[PDB]
Swiss-Prot record:
Keywords: Host-virus interaction, Nucleus, Phosphoprotein, Repeat, Transferase, Ubl conjugation, Ubl conjugation pathway
Originating organism: Homo sapiens (Human)
Shown chain mapped onto the complete sequence: 492 to 864 of 870
Name recorded for this polypeptide: NEDD4-like E3 ubiquitin-protein ligase WWP2
GO biological process: extracellular transport; negative regulation of DNA-templated transcription; negative regulation of gene expression; negative regulation of Notch signaling pathway; negative regulation of potassium ion export across plasma membrane; negative regulation of protein transport; negative regulation of transcription by RNA polymerase II; negative regulation of transporter activity
Tissue expression summary: Detected in heart, throughout the brain, placenta, lung, liver, muscle, kidney and pancreas. Also detected in spleen and peripheral blood leukocytes.
Impact reported for C335A: Abolishes ubiquitination of POU5F1
Active site (UniProt): C335 (glycyl thioester intermediate)
Function: E3 ubiquitin-protein ligase which accepts ubiquitin from an E2 ubiquitin-conjugating enzyme in the form of a thioester and then directly transfers the ubiquitin to targeted substrates. Polyubiquitinates POU5F1 by 'Lys-63'-linked conjugation and promotes it to proteasomal degradation; in embryonic stem cells (ESCs) the ubiquitination is proposed to regulate POU5F1 protein level. Ubiquitinates EGR2 and promotes it to proteasomal degradation; in T-cells the ubiquitination inhibits activation-induced cell death.
Subunit note: Interacts with POU5F1, RBP1, EGR2 and SLC11A2. Interacts with SCNN1A, SCNN1B, SCNN1G, WBP1, WBP2 and ATN1. Interacts with ERBB4, NDFIP1 and NDFIP2. Interacts with ARRDC4. Interacts (via WW domains) with ARRDC1 (via PPxY motifs); ubiquitinates ARRDC1. Interacts (via WW domains) with ARRDC2 and ARRDC3.
Post-translational modification: Autoubiquitinated. Ubiquitinated by the SCF(FBXL15) complex, leading to its degradation by the proteasome.
Length: 361
């Protein structure tokens, strides 16, 4: 497929080609901002949202749309509503809340957020909600993979990766094709698990973890998003690019990044890292973000730059270490912000290998 720049352009014209006359009024007070928006947009028909956007606060003027999109994207994350939760510590790994059914109209709210996210894309405006790549995969009809579990849920990854090797007979646990779900207070048989059908079991579990409890809500969100902007229009994008379009690119500070990097079996004076920073310098900004996405799981820096960078287990700085065979592609552990970089024999190989890994893996 083509360069992102080309894909964005092709997406833009598809939006513009399908744009429609006149405009839409959505007026909201800053206290009532979430409720207002809700009622207004749900009472509007999805198509009408592709018209020109006129937003009024009741009070003053000013610019106003970018705020509205920004404020409302933060306001939906308020745990007060039980729509979205964080799997990890300190706002790590945003996801739909299984206990969202606590409010009986929750699906209409997810449908509302759907439309809202589609408006942001369709009208060229950015949000800072903080969805994770697997959320974006599902918007692109991509099955989340085994490595995406590591991004959201490290302990569950380790127990699956352990299950993958070695009989398991040297074990005392049956591991039936069933899973318990503790929510708000709570073909399909126990089955036999075998060396053969571990590979079936693992898939079903990998699928299950991402989908568990958030099935009608995710459907609600997409039928959401679709009513306004068809998902077909996204088909050529990958998840990292989708995130990019919704969050926006920003200037990476190469100094901040290099000062705030730690090491395992390596040093700044070591030759792999000298080459590493040489290729990162050699990159344009679109590739630097791609690298950051590859290593951290996102294209957005935390407030305070590379020093304040968080993983799954609290504060976790960007780190490279001598792991993997040479003649291997470097691989990330996004939950720890770690990059396994093999001790490649020359700069040339490493440079070649790093670029492909960032772009293809």
């Amino acid at each position: 497929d083509r360069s992102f720049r080309w894909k964005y352009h092709q997406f833009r014209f598809l939006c513009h080609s399908n744009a429609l006359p006149s405009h839409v009024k959505i007026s909201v007070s800053r206290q009532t901002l979430f409720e207002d928006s809700f009622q207004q947009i749900m009472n509007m028909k999805p198509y009408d949202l592709r018209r020109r956007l006129y937003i009024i606060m009741r009070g003053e003027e000013g610019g106003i749309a970018r705020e509205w999109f920004f404020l409302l994207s933060h306001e939906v994350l308020n745990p007060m509503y039980c729509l979205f939760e964080y799997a990890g510590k300190n706002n790590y790994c945003l996801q739909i809340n299984p206990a969202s059914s606590i409010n009986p109209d929750h699906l209409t709210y997810f449908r509302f957020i759907g439309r809202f996210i589609a408006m942001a894309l369709y009208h060229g405006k950015f949000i800072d909600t903080g969805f994770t790549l697997p959320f974006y995969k599902r918007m692109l009809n991509k099955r989340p993979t085994l490595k995406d579990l590591e991004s959201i849920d490290p302990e569950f990854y380790n127990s699956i990766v352990w299950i993958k090797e070695n009989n398991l007979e040297e074990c005392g646990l049956e591991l039936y094709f069933i899973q318990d779900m503790e929510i708000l207070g709570k073909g399909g048989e126990s089955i036999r698990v075998t060396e053969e059908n571990k590979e079936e079991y693992i898939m079903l579990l990998t699928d299950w973890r991402f989908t568990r409890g958030v099935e009608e809500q995710t459907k609600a969100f997409l039928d959401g998003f679709n009513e306004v902007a068809p998902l077909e229009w996204l088909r050529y994008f990958d998840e990292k690019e989708l995130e990019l379009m919704l969050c926006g690119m920003q200037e990476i500070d190469m100094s901040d990044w290099q000062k705030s990097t730690i090491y395992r079996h390596y040093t700044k004076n070591s030759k792999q890292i000298q080459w590493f920073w040489q290729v990162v310098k050699e990159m344009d900004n679109e590739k630097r973000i791609r690298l950051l996405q590859f290593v951290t799981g996102t294209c957005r820096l935390p407030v305070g730059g590379f020093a304040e960078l968080i993983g799954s287990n609290g504060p976790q700085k960007f780190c490279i270490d001598k792991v993997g065979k040479e003649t291997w592609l470097p691989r990330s552990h996004t939950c720890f912000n770690r990059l396994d970089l093999p001790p490649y024999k020359s700069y040339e190989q490493l440079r070649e290998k790093l670029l492909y890994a960032i772009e293809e893996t």
